Amino acid sequence: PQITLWKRPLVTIRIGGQLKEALLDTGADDTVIEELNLPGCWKPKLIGGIXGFIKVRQYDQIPVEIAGHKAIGTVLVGPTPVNIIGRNLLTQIGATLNF
Numbered sequence: 001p002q003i004t005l006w007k008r009p010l011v012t013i014r015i016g017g018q019l020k021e022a023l024l025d026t027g028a029d030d031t032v033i034e035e036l037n038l039p040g041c042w043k044p045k046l047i048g049g050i051x052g053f054i055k056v057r058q059y060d061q062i063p064v065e066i067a068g069h070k071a072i073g074t075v076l077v078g079p080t081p082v083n084i085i086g087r088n089l090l091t092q093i094g095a096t097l098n099f
């Protein structure tokens with residue numbers, strides 16, 4: 001599909017068997033999702049942006065479907081204000097910027 005940028009590029013994702021809404025963010029290196037449990041598998045990380053840093057739980061090799069496209073990769077979990085799909089998964093679904 002093609003997504004224009006007149007409004008925030010929000011899409012439905014599936015993760016850990018749960019459906020969420022997330023923002024496709026080309027300015028994010030990584031993917032950041034709120035709450036939800038998961039694997040006895042995670043390790044600590046700090047990630048930053050405007051306003052500084054938050055502590056997150058890094059989970060590896062997590063299956064994540066995005067607009068019907070299967071991806072599998074690192075997912076960071078913490079108190080992000082907005083669920084974010086970053087380049088680590090956008091590359092797996094063949095996403096490009098075009099102008």
Ligand SMILES: CCCC[C@@H](CN[C@@H](CCCC)C(=O)N[C@@H](CCC(N)=O)C(=O)N[C@@H](CCCNC(N)=[NH2+])C(N)=O)NC(=O)[C@@H](NC(=O)[C@@H](NC(C)=O)[C@@H](C)O)[C@@H](C)CC
Nearest residue numbers: 008023025027028029030032047048049050081082084086
């Ligand atoms: C400045 C750092 C690079 C750009 C920034 C864009 N992320 C979005 C995330 C959405 C908000 C949680 C953002 O900050 N958007 C702001 C940009 C400022 C702006 N005014 O446009 C925004 O839209 N802010 C809205 C409010 C939130 C809107 N978004 C939304 N509701 N979805 C605004 N009006 O204030 N990327 C990031 O914040 C990511 N940071 C990174 O990718 C890198 N970190 C650093 C420090 O560069 C990497 C080394 O970790 C985060 C997610 C970690 C992977």
